[PDB]
Design a protein around this ligand. Structure first.
Ligand SMILES: *[C@@H]1O[C@H](CO)[C@@H](O)[C@H](O)[C@H]1NC(C)=O
Ligand SMILES: *[C@@H]1O[C@H](CO)[C@@H](O)[C@H](O)[C@H]1NC(C)=O
Ligand SMILES: *[C@@H]1O[C@H](CO)[C@@H](O)[C@H](O)[C@H]1NC(C)=O
Ligand SMILES: *[C@@H]1O[C@H](CO)[C@@H](O)[C@H](O)[C@H]1NC(C)=O
Ligand SMILES: *[C@@H]1O[C@H](CO)[C@@H](O)[C@H](O)[C@H]1NC(C)=O
Ligand SMILES: *[C@@H]1O[C@H](CO)[C@@H](O)[C@H](O)[C@H]1NC(C)=O
Ligand SMILES: *[C@@H]1O[C@H](CO)[C@@H](O)[C@H](O)[C@H]1NC(C)=O
Ligand SMILES: *[C@@H]1O[C@H](CO)[C@@H](O)[C@H](O)[C@H]1NC(C)=O
Ligand SMILES: *[C@@H]1O[C@H](CO)[C@@H](O)[C@H](O)[C@H]1NC(C)=O
Lengths: 420, 55, 166, 148, 50
């Protein structure tokens, strides 16, 4: 037994004239698993409380209209689950299809794209997820409106659309674009010029393929990835098991079985035991319905979040700081799950920092020069201009700096010359 | 003399059939790892006795 | 022991001193005949909910009836789906957008005069002509106005407990 | 007339709950009668307390059920109202870059309009049309230089 | 990783984020610092009093 450690004790070497700029990048792929729907179950009130005894039913009519309310609530929950699944997945106008040629500029999408040999449109990672997860007294389990085959088809349509047309299909028509230029645009989104991609296309493709391999290995090896889905399944199963076991508590009556109560006693002396059983079973059913309503509210919130994440990360590129993965967002890919959806967030994270000496401005002929885009850095003797998110130094020029003011107001302006 | 009970002395409690079910029951059982006397004197029979003999 | 159900031969291996048998949730599912010592299996008789599919009162008066979780062997045109047996709706090999969702990807609708049950169509089959050196760029725009309706508040109602009860 | 589905749904749900409570006022609950005045008039207090207690138990249970359902509905409506406030702030008082927060396409502006128990947003959106095939190139080679 | 940056250049970037050039900060650094310190003082006063 110990006192837990919050983390390391990193202390950044902050100085008023020194900055650190990355010189290399290691694009990373992560996952995020979100449940979207529960099992559609509806429990008959009359058959649960009484089953087939007409005397018990006639006693139950004296209690009012509780059973109608419970059935209405369960029906609402089931319809809500169907709506959750439809909102999360049914977002694409047309079922797109990936072209037979896979000239994606060195990127390999075979692990996530559907395979004809595999069942329906289920991919390799979808198969791993679907394999990873590990009548009665009035109880029915309704089947979902959207089968797993249709959900996988929707997912494949989304994948084909985002691979082929980029983010264009999420707004209007599907405007095709080669994947290299699409990634160039996505780098331009996070503030890194496109030549960085075009000169490191092979390295970026290798990194992405390695990341996909690591994801598939971590999904196949460890079984703790789908914590939330298993938790939801276990909660629903626990509630159902508790209800079925509550069918067998005396509740004060002579016996926990209705048939023996009817057979052993006359109606005047049996009504008391029947009423005790009715009260207990009605209370248990009400508790079950309330818990299911709260769980349905939580699942609806989760499904709304999943739909928002799909819309703003699969059908586009989000500038929100940590909405989709850690780092700077590039793109995301959806994959199906038994009762959820997993997003593979491809993210650009800078690496291999380097110390440098900086300056707010440059004094030239008494003029103050500020960088048009980027920041002033020095390697020790010379001064250069580089973008903030990469180390691509350039000679200071009037074409990448703008002049405004003098060398008397800015604090830290240094001597230098600008070539035109 | 004394010996540990180990895991000896479990019997069918309710003569009903159960398959692939973990059942929790309360009944007069011999506790695990208890002290069982090893041997014809008079023995104080107290609400059940586990009598085990060898060849 | 009194109950209602269907009795079938069972493979359960009762020990020679067990007469009853309890499944999960503590329910009696097996019994021993007291004259022939036969091991009988008790299972509940078939049951389920019924559902009525209606295309509207003022559009038509015919309906289709769905017996949820009931095989067709138990009681115009009968068609078996993944959720119970259907009666009164014919099956079509065509695919249309879902109108009345039955379940398991199967919907029903009113088309010419009769009720039809089909497998719903997710959408079109557009295939983008992706090429490694060709792109498509728009040449015109059509600005559009849409609506989105969001409820914000309910009716402020307060019920007196004492006056309600007494 | 199908535009205001959600508002009508909310109104119908509240009306259904109130009607169910009022109808629950008239179930025997096991007592001799479903009316309290006749119970008081026909029986002495020692023999009337049992029926009064049965009615009290039933009515209290029904009221508790109503209150719980109303609490859950209020939570859902509060979530909806929070979403509506966020949409107003980030789409009427500005222009949102979120992909499909406000309409389908590229957001331009939105206009609010009132509603009986809600608010409607008119999302003006720029959507491109009339595509055209073209041949592209990542860069241009000129004097051995790469132009982007 | 934690890439260090002087606070003045960080505020210049943050001004560039909201569509105002960085020379606006670099020429009004003292005034902006005074305004920020006064705002912090007002926050502490309003928290301590009310
Ligand atoms: C993609 O990777 C798989 C295995 O990781 C490999 O079998 C396949 O050949 C790769 N794709 C291409 C186009 O080489
Ligand atoms: C930068 O310099 C500081 C001290 O000035 C040092 O602590 C830090 O490790 C250096 N970082 C790199 C990447 O050189
Ligand atoms: C800095 O870069 C310039 C490039 O012109 C080079 O001449 C100089 O040697 C470099 N200084 C150091 C300390 O590396
Ligand atoms: C940084 O601090 C040093 C000493 O603390 C000082 O000499 C120098 O002028 C400062 N530079 C800037 C730009 O504030
Ligand atoms: C170079 O900078 C120094 C400040 O240390 C100052 O003399 C002036 O700004 C520059 N010198 C010139 C312009 O001769
Ligand atoms: C049938 O009802 C619908 C909606 O209730 C209505 O729009 C339509 O006009 C009605 N048709 C007739 C013939 O009354
Ligand atoms: C329904 O009943 C028929 C006739 O008994 C039988 O052949 C069929 O297999 C049953 N359906 C299922 C799903 O078992
Ligand atoms: C519809 O499909 C069934 C099943 O294969 C077939 O027997 C029937 O002839 C088909 N009808 C039409 C009109 O294609
Ligand atoms: C563009 O060309 C492809 C085939 O190369 C064709 O399928 C598509 O319809 C064309 N689109 C337009 C807008 O011309």
């Amino acid at each position: 037994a110990y006192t837990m450690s919050l983390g390391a004790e990193n202390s950044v070497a902050y100085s008023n004239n020194s900055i650190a700029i990355p010189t290399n990048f290691t694009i990373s792929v992560t996952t995020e698993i979100l449940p979207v729907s529960m099992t559609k179950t509806s429990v008959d009130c009359t058959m649960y409380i009484c089953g087939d005894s007409t005397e018990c039913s006639n006693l139950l009519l004296q209690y009012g209209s509780f059973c109608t309310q419970l059935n209405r609530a369960l029906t609402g929950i089931a319809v809500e689950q169907d709506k959750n699944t439809q909102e999360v997945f049914a977002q694409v106008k047309q079922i797109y299809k990936t072209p037979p040629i896979k000239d994606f500029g060195g990127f390999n999408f075979s692990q996530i794209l559907p395979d004809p040999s595999k069942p329906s449109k289920r991919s390799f990672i979808e198969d791993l997820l679907f394999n990873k997860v590990t009548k009665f007294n009035g109880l029915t389990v309704l089947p979902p409106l959207l089968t797993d085959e249709m959900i996988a088809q929707y997912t494949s349509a989304l994948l084909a659309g985002t691979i082929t047309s980029g983010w264009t299909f999420g707004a209007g028509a599907a405007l095709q674009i080669p994947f290299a230029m699409q990634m160039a645009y996505r780098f331009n989104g996070i503030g890194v010029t496109q030549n960085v991609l075009y000169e490191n296309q092979k390295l970026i493709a290798n990194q992405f393929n390695s990341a996909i391999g690591k994801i598939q290995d971590s999904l196949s090896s460890t079984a703790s990835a789908l914590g939330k889905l298993q938790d939801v399944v276990n909660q629903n199963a626990q509630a159902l098991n508790t209800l079925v076991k509550q069918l067998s508590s005396n509740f004060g009556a002579i016996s926990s079985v209705l048939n023996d109560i009817l057979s052993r006693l006359d109606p005047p002396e049996a009504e008391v035991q029947i009423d005790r059983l009715i009260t207990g079973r009605l209370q248990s059913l009400q508790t079950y319905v309330t818990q299911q309503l709260i769980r349905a509210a939580e699942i609806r919130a989760s499904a709304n979040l999943a739909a928002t994440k799909m819309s703003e990360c699969v059908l586009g590129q989000s500038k929100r700081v940590d909405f989709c993965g850690k780092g700077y967002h590039l793109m995301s890919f959806p994959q199906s799950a038994p009762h959820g959806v997993v997003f593979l967030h491809v993210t650009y994270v800078p690496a291999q920092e380097k110390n440098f000496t900086t300056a707010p401005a440059i004094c030239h002929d008494g003029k103050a020069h500020f960088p048009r885009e980027g920041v002033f850095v020095s390697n020790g003797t010379h001064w250069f201009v580089t973008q903030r998110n990469f180390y691509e130094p350039q000679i200071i020029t009037t074409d990448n700096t703008f002049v405004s003011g003098n060398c008397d107001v800015v604090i830290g302006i240094v001597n230098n010359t600008v070539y035109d | 003399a004394y010996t540990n009970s180990f895991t000896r002395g479990v019997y069918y409690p309710d003569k009903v059939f159960r398959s692939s079910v973990l059942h929790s029951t309360q009944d007069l059982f011999l506790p695990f790892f208890s002290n069982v006397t090893w041997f014809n004197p008079v023995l104080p029979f107290n609400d059940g006795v586990y009598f085990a003999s060898t060849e | 022991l009194t109950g209602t159900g269907v009795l079938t031969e069972s493979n359960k291996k009762f020990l020679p001193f067990q007469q009853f048998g309890r499944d999960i949730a503590d329910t009696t599912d097996a019994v021993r005949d007291p004259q022939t010592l036969e091991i009988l299996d008790i299972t509940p008789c078939s049951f389920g909910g019924v559902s009525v599919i209606t295309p509207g009162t003022n559009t038509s008066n015919q309906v289709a009836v769905l017996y949820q979780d009931v095989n067709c062997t138990e009681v115009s045109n009968v068609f078996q789906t993944r959720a119970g047996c259907l009666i009164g709706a014919e099956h079509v090999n065509n695919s249309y957008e879902c109108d009345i969702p039955i379940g398991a990807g199967i919907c029903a609708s009113y088309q010419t005069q009769s009720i039809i049950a089909y497998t719903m169509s997710l959408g079109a089959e557009n295939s983008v002509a992706y090429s490694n050196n060709s792109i498509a760029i728009p040449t015109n725009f059509t600005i559009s106005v849409t609506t989105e309706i969001l409820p914000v508040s309910m009716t402020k109602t307060s019920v007196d407990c004492t006056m309600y009860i007494c």
